[PDB]
Every structure is written in structure tokens, then in C-alpha cells.
């Protein structure tokens with residue numbers, strides 16, 4: 001079952017989707033948007049990373065991808081990266097290289113096995129997640145993460161553990177968050193994503209949210225509105 | 238290259254205690270401590286032994302994974318959080334001795350001994366009232382092997398124990414570590430060992446300190462972070 005709970009509309013426009021792993025129930029503020037597919041954008045770094053590691057395009061979390069020297073918009077982009085940092089600073093050029101070397105045939109094969117969204121890579125092999133034909137909703141995101149969480153994707157366990165390490169966002173004595181932000185820019189309607197999960201001592205709560213993002217301004221709200229939902233729901237303090 | 242820094246003693250002095258922190262700059266392969274002698278004095282590992290113990294239990298299959306549930310034996314102990322079911326993640330977080338005691342009995346003395354020798358861990362419930370001793374400088378040497386997946390256990394066993402050691406993370410650093418409290422033999426001391434991952438570097442640390450009562454326990458982490466701040470490692 002799924003409860004719709006419109007009170008979180010207050011903290012917003014967009015949708016927040018929770019799955020209670022133990023109880024095996026869901027929660028959202030908009031059943032219908034929860035099922036509306038969008039461009040994944042940088043949340044594509046999760047399955048890109050999984051595929052790059054399983055195929056050995058990436059050796060491990062330590063391998064250095066060296067800055068090509070050309071200076072791009074985001075300053076954190078313009079240095080050397082490994083997988084941990086590339087993922088922290090959402091470094092597109094690193095992941096483009098990954099996509100090229102994966103190739104179009106292996107990429108779609110992998111996406112079909114992951115049952116990822118609409119499973120469709122039309123557009124450029126190095127930007128389809130931004131402006132090609134790929135589409136995934138919040139509930140499709142959760143569904144993918146659930147599998148990632150349990151090591152049941154059709155890639156090695158090792159590859160699964162490394163990406164979840166690279167997904168590390170926050171941890172304290174209350175909870176651990178593993179997640180990835182995204183910001184769909186090239187194609188309407190512009191939207192900001194956050195998806196991942198929060199680990200508790202004796203449960204795990206999966207989450208996917210997106211919201212309208214007409215401006216670069218509101219990016220902080222992806223975390224802040226999701227966290228406000230998590231408190232009202234007393235999942236975190 | 239080791240460098241002795243007496244200024245850190247004021248972080249100990251400030252709470253009327255004494256102790257050592259040892260720091261290791263992985264990129265530069267340089268160490269730093271406030272007390273060279275105590276750096277290399279060997280103490281009972283106490284709960285920091287949960288590190289090699291966890292590694293060994295996983296590599297052998299005594300623990301199958303971080304979700305395997307170790308149920309409470311129903312005997313009520315005085316850490317309240319121990320009186321519940323646990324997995325590897327929680328048992329490490331709440332430092333749950335009777336789960337780890339089960340691990341050790343199942344590992345057994347032969348296999349334990351030969352695994353610790355392969356780890357080059359310490360000297361040649363023993364971690365708490367008995368035999369094994371290790372120094373803060375040796376904890377770091379052991380942790381560095383772990384960090385690099387260089388121990389004689391599977392890569393997998395090393396990644397699960399590192400996941401289990403996760404203590405703190407934010408946009409500035411990740412800390413993976415383990416606290417300990419040696420209470421049975423003099424001198425009663427507290428420990429915190431582990432490391433800090435930055436974007437560009439990792440800093441390993443190992444600290445111990447006189448701990449006559451459980452009241453100063455918080456100082457293990459606090460004095461350590463006071464030292465990390467002084468050296469511009471965290472904000």
C-alpha cells in the first residue's frame with residue numbers, strides 16, 4: 001500500500017517518495033507525480049558508475065582520471081578526480097568518458113538488465129541522460145535503489161559495494177545517508193532530483209524526490225525539503 | 238620522519254588528563270605525535286579489537302555479511318543498547334561485546350592466532366583482561382594495510398569492515414574509526430583509532446588516554462578533533 005499525504009505540499013512544487021523497507025509500504029505527497037518519468041540527469045551517475053566498474057572501465061575507487069586541462073563552468077570539476085570525488089562533485093566529463101568506453105550496445109544491454117526506467121538511450125552516448133530519450137520516475141528510482149541496496153543488480157557484488165561507498169553523503173550516530181543529486185537542465189520541464197536512502201539501526205527508508213527548478217537558485221531545497229519530510233515523518237531528528 | 242609536538246598536551250592538560258595522539262599524513266608519509274614515548278607503548282586494545290576480530294569472522298564465514306542477525310541471548314547487561322538483536326553494523330556501533338565473544342569462540346584460538354600473526358597485529362576474551370597488547374603507532378600500521386586492502390583476507394572482508402567502521406561523514410571529511418575502553422588492567426585508558434578521508438589525502442590517527450572513570454569517555458573523540466582542527470585537517 002501507498003498513502004498519499006498532502007501535508008508535505010506545505011514544505012514545497014514537486015514530489016517526495018518514501019519506501020519503508022521493513023514494513024514494505026510507501027508514502028508520497030502526489031501519487032501521480034511519483035509515477036511521472038523525467039530525465040535522470042546526474043542521478044545517472046549511479047548506474048553509469050555500476051556499469052563502468054563491472055566492465056572494468058574503472059579499476060577501483062582509487063584510480064585517478066586526470067583533468068584534461070580545459071576549464072569548465074564548475075570549479076570543483078577542474079582538477080584530478082577519482083570515483084569518490086567525481087561522484088561528490090558530480091563531474092560530468094569523467095562520466096562522459098565512462099559512457100564512451102562502455103559503448104552504446106553494452107550501455108543499453110546493462111540498462112535493460114537493471115530494468116532502469118524506460119530503458120532507452122537515444123541521443124548521444126555521452127549525454128543521453130541529460131538530453132536524449134531516457135526517462136525514469138521517482139518510484140522507478142526507488143525500485144532501482146532497492147536492488148542496489150540488496151546486491152541484487154546483475155553486476156558483481158564488489159561493483160555494488162563500491163558505488164554505495166561512493167554514494168556516501170552524510171553519517172552520524174542517528175542515520176547514514178547514501179544518495180545522489182541531479183539537475184535536469186537541457187529539456188523542459190527543468191527539475192532538481194535527490195534519490196537514495198537513509199539507513200537506520202533497524203530499518204532502511206528509500207527516497208526519491210524531484211521538484212521544479214527554473215533557476216539554479218533552488219538547488220539547496222532538494223536536500224532541505226526532503227529532510228523536512230524526513231523529520232515530520234520522525235525518521236531522523 | 239616523526240615530529241614530536243608538545244603543544245598538543247594543552248588539549249590534554251585542559252581536562253586534567255594525559256595521553257597521546259598520533260597522526261599520519263598518508264601522502265607525505267610523515268607522522269606527528271605529542272609524546273613519542275607513549276606513541277610506542279603497548280596497551281590492551283579493548284574494543285578496538287573489534288576491528289581485526291570483524292575481519293577474521295568475515296573472511297572465515299563466521300559472519301556471512303553485515304545483515305546477518307545475531308539475536309540477543311536474553312540476558313540483560315548494563316549497556317542498554319546491547320540488550321537487543323544486532324548485525325555487524327550495529328554491533329560495531331554499540332560496541333557489543335557478547336556478540337564479538339560469540340565470534341571469537343567460533344573463530345577459535347588456533348585460527349585467531351595465526352590470523353593475528355598474518356596481520357602482524359600486536360605482540361608475541363584476551364583483548365580485555367589478558368594477553369594481546371598494541372601501541373598507537375602499531376594501530377596506525379595495521380589501519381593503513383586495511384585502508385589499502387593489503388591484509389591477508391579477502392578484499393570483500395576488508396570493504397565490509399570499513400563500511401562497518403563508518404562513524405561520521407559530511408561535505409568536508411569522512412571518519413572511519415573505533416573507540417575502546419580498557420578497564421580490567423591498570424592503567425585504565427580510552428582509545429580511538431581510525432582515519433580521516435579528505436578529497437586529496439587521508440590522515441590516519443590513533444589516540445589513547447588515561448581514563449580512571451567512564452566520565453571522560455567523550456574526550457577520546459573531542460581531544461582528537463581538537464588536534465585535527467589545530468592542524469587544519471578539519472575546519
Ligand SMILES: *C(=O)N1C[C@H](NOS(=O)(=O)O)CC[C@H]1C(N)=O
Nearest residue numbers: 041042090092181182183184185
Ligand atoms: C547533473 O545533474 N549535473 C552535473 C552537475 N551537478 O549537478 S548536481 O548539483 O545535481 O549534482 C551540474 C548539473 C547537471 C548538469 N548540468 O549536467
Ligand SMILES: *C(=O)N1C[C@H](NOS(=O)(=O)O)CC[C@H]1C(N)=O
Nearest residue numbers: 283284285332416417418419420
Ligand atoms: C570496549 O572497549 N568496550 C565495550 C563497550 N564499548 O565501549 S567503547 O565506546 O569504548 O567502545 C564498553 C567498554 C569496553 C569494555 N568494557 O569492554
